[PDB]
């Protein structure tokens, strides 16, 4: 009584939500950006995604997408300086909160994570290197 | 090795909520008309609303900003549901729990329905 308002956090929710966002990415629905990842004259690799989700993972993505002006349809964004396999895992991280690596690719991933200022991935890579 | 950063989705939602409140990257405007109350507009991200509700997901699955009209749900309810989608938290009280529950039912947001029922039964 007394017009008091109560708040309730639903603890399973953000994990289920990200799962749905990842599903939509993989079925290429609602996406508004296509990344064209050109590295060292390999053929360009394409990844579709949602700007709001990439921005939520990376201050670099957030600045890129919120700063200028385009046609507010599907934007094709040229990306250089990072291997597509690295960018693939950084996108997967933004949508899953998980990242996989091996001895042969941890430095690659760390380098990408530094470049996109994904601090939590940088720290996971560090953890991996030291063990 | 595989890592899961257990705090990440909470932090990400924080940022998406910030972008919603600053009206950045939004691709849907909900125009909500109820009874005699003033019309309200809510800008959001279709992918985030879809993440919260099978009804929003079906609704959206067009290019650019889409203006979508909704009738027969009070703007304050819709506002609570949007806030939930971006925070994982729902607010209610004695005099609006049925209204929030109705909204959650309509949008098939089962977690929120259950939280409303829990609240109602506690009274
Ligand atoms: C850990 C190694 C690994 O799993 N893979 C997957 C299959 O492709 C090769 C290899 C890999 C993974 C990543 Cl994330 C990056 C790279 C890579 N190779 C060369 N140059 C760069 N910049 N990255 C290989
Ligand atoms: C719990 C009651 C409450 O917190 N509020 C918030 C401030 O506005 C008044 C009141 C409220 C909240 C909600 Cl979610 C809905 C309504 C409402 N009033 C009339 N008709 C409808 N459909 N909803 C009031």
Curated annotation (Swiss-Prot), chain A:
Domain of life, per lineage: Eukaryota
Site feature (Sensor for electrophilic agents) residues: 105
Tissues expressing the protein: Broadly expressed, with highest levels in skeletal muscle.
Residues in cross-link N5-[4-(S-L-cysteinyl)-5-methyl-1H-imidazol-2-yl]-L-ornithine (Arg-Cys) (interchain with C-151 in KEAP1): 89
UniProt PTM: Non-enzymatic covalent modifications of reactive cysteines by electrophile metabolites inactivate the BCR(KEAP1) complex. Accumulation of fumarate promotes the formation of cysteine S-succination (S-(2-succinyl)cysteine), leading to inactivate the BCR(KEAP1) complex and promote NFE2L2/NRF2 nuclear accumulation and activation. Nitric oxide-dependent 8-Nitro-cGMP formation promotes cysteine guanylation (S-cGMP-cysteine), leading to NFE2L2/NRF2 nuclear accumulation and activation.
PTM annotation (S-(2-succinyl)cysteine): residues: 105
Record PTM S-(2,3-dicarboxypropyl)cysteine, positions in chain: 105
Signal sequence interval, chain numbering: none
Effect of residue 89 to A: Reduced formation of a high-molecular mass KEAP1 molecule when methylglyoxal accumulates
Cross-link (N5-[4-(S-L-cysteinyl)-5-methyl-1H-imidazol-2-yl]-L-ornithine (Cys-Arg) (interchain with R-135 in KEAP1)) at residue(s): 105
Residues annotated as domain BTB: 31-103
S-nitrosocysteine found at: 105
Compartment(s): Cytoplasm; Nucleus
Family membership: Belongs to the KEAP1 family.
Primary role: Substrate-specific adapter of a BCR (BTB-CUL3-RBX1) E3 ubiquitin ligase complex that regulates the response to oxidative stress by targeting NFE2L2/NRF2 for ubiquitination. KEAP1 acts as a key sensor of oxidative and electrophilic stress: in normal conditions, the BCR(KEAP1) complex mediates ubiquitination and degradation of NFE2L2/NRF2, a transcription factor regulating expression of many cytoprotective genes.
Entry's free-text remark on domains: KEAP1 contains reactive cysteine residues that act as sensors for endogenously produced and exogenously encountered small molecules, which react with sulfhydryl groups and modify the cysteine sensors, leading to impair ability of the BCR(KEAP1) complex to ubiquitinate target proteins. The Kelch repeats mediate interaction with NFE2L2/NRF2, BPTF and PGAM5.
Oligomer status and interactors: Component of the BCR(KEAP1) E3 ubiquitin ligase complex, at least composed of 2 molecules of CUL3, 2 molecules of KEAP1, and RBX1. Interacts with NFE2L2/NRF2; the interaction is direct. Forms a ternary complex with NFE2L2/NRF2 and PGAM5. Interacts with (phosphorylated) SQSTM1/p62; the interaction is direct and inactivates the BCR(KEAP1) complex by sequestering it in inclusion bodies, promoting its degradation. Interacts with NFE2L1. Interacts with BPTF and PTMA. Interacts with MAP1LC3B. Interacts indirectly with ENC1. Interacts with SESN1 and SESN2. Interacts with HSP90AA1 and HSP90AB1. (Microbial infection) Interacts with ebolavirus protein VP24; this interaction activates transcription factor NFE2L2/NRF2 by blocking its interaction with KEAP1.
Record protein name field: Kelch-like ECH-associated protein 1
Source organism phylogeny: Eukaryota, Metazoa, Chordata, Craniata, Vertebrata
Residues of the full protein shown: 48 to 177 of 624
């Amino acid at each position: 009584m007394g017009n008091r308002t109560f708040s309730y956090t639903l603890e399973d929710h953000t994990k289920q939500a990200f799962g749905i966002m990842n599903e939509l990415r993989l079925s290429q629905q609602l996406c508004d950006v296509t990344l064209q990842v050109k590295y060292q004259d390999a053929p360009a690799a394409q990844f579709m995604a949602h700007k709001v989700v990439l921005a939520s993972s990376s201050p670099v993505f957030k600045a890129m997408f919120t700063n200028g002006l385009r046609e507010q349809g599907m934007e094709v964004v040229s990306i250089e300086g990072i291997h597509p396999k690295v960018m693939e895992r950084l996108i997967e991280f933004a949508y899953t909160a998980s990242i996989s690596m091996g001895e042969k690719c941890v430095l690659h991933v760390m380098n990408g994570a530094v470049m996109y200022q994904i601090d939590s991935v940088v720290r996971a890579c560090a953890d991996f290197l030291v063990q």
